[PDB]
Amino acid sequence: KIKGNVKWFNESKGFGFITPEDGSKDVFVHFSAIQTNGFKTLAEGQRVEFEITNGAKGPSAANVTAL
Template identity: 75%
Template sequence: GNDVFVHFSAIQEEGFKTLYEGDVVEFEIVEGPKGLQAANVCKV
């Protein structure tokens, strides 16, 4: 699929917010100031 920008503030997790390659996540795609970006990112 296409790449989507993820800002750390969109990650719905307590403590240190980070994603690793291979993490399975669910998210919404929204229009940001510089194009498409992820919102409400949750690890599954």
């Protein structure tokens, strides 16, 4: 439900961060959130849409889809 860009992602460890478009704080994303359709990874800079959930790492991204 909100839009952002992948700031940083590590493939093997299975996590990264997304910068929301509204300029609010970066949110954690786990590979299990990535809706695909192949490699569960995200490229630095990629535009995504996601929902915020309250997880072990604080505000986190759920249901992450490519834009």
